[PDB]
Amino acid sequence: XXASLXXASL
Numbered sequence: 001x002x003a004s005l006x007x008a009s010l
């Protein structure tokens, strides 16, 4: 999410 992948999140 944030249109990104990282911090264990999409």
Ligand SMILES: [Ca+2]
Binding pocket: 001, 002
């Ligand atoms: Ca969002």
